[PDB]
């Protein structure tokens, strides 16, 4: 699909590949959310946590959803919209994951859960936009959230709910200005 969808899939592959050459921990040291307030002005970390994945199914499953839902947002709502959904959601989901469990997390699923929230609510309140999420996925999303609450694995439950929430809020606002 779009330039933004694709730029983000290449970033996560490039970072994934570095984690394989350098090791996770080495890459985490630089891209993870600030663990020590001294690092708080290293601004990229509020975002870069999103680019890290820790297995191949981790990256594939995330890029999958990201491709499907992100491309749909870019295709219909434009690249500027997708950028804004990505940035605010990586930041806010990172922020809440950190409060939940500290700064050692990564993945794009926070941004994905925002996308699922946006695509579903926007598709429900403003079907005129031309996106919508099929119920089969809104059930898979729901199963996915709660399957993190019970852990059989190691999910970022603060990221999922925070991202999810962000995507419903952004979608609500956007379906008023419609």
């Amino acid at each position: 699909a779009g330039p933004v969808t694709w730029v983000m899939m290449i970033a996560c592959v490039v970072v994934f590949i570095a984690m394989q050459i350098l090791g996770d921990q080495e890459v985490m040291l630089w891209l993870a959310w600030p663990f020590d307030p001294t690092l708080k002005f290293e601004f990229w970390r509020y975002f870069t946590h999103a680019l890290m994945h820790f297995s191949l199914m981790h990256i594939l499953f995330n890029l999958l959803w990201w491709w499907y839902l992100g491309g749909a947002v870019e295709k219909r709502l434009g690249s500027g919209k997708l950028i804004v959904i990505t940035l605010i959601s990586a930041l806010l989901s990172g922020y809440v994951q950190q409060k939940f469990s500290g700064p050692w997390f990564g993945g794009l699923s926070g941004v994905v859960f925002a996308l699922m929230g946006y695509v579903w609510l926007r598709g429900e309140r403003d079907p005129q936009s031309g996106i919508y999420l099929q119920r089969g996925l809104i059930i898979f999303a729901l199963i996915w959230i709660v399957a993190g609450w019970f852990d059989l694995m190691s999910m970022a439950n603060g990221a999922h709910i925070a991202g999810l929430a962000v995507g419903l809020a952004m979608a609500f606002v956007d379906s008023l200005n419609a």
């Binding site: 996770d24 999103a50 997390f105 190691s154 970022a156 999922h160």
Partner: peptide, 4 residues
């Protein structure tokens, strides 16, 4: 580590 946790996976978002």
């Amino acid at each position: 580590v946790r996976m978002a």
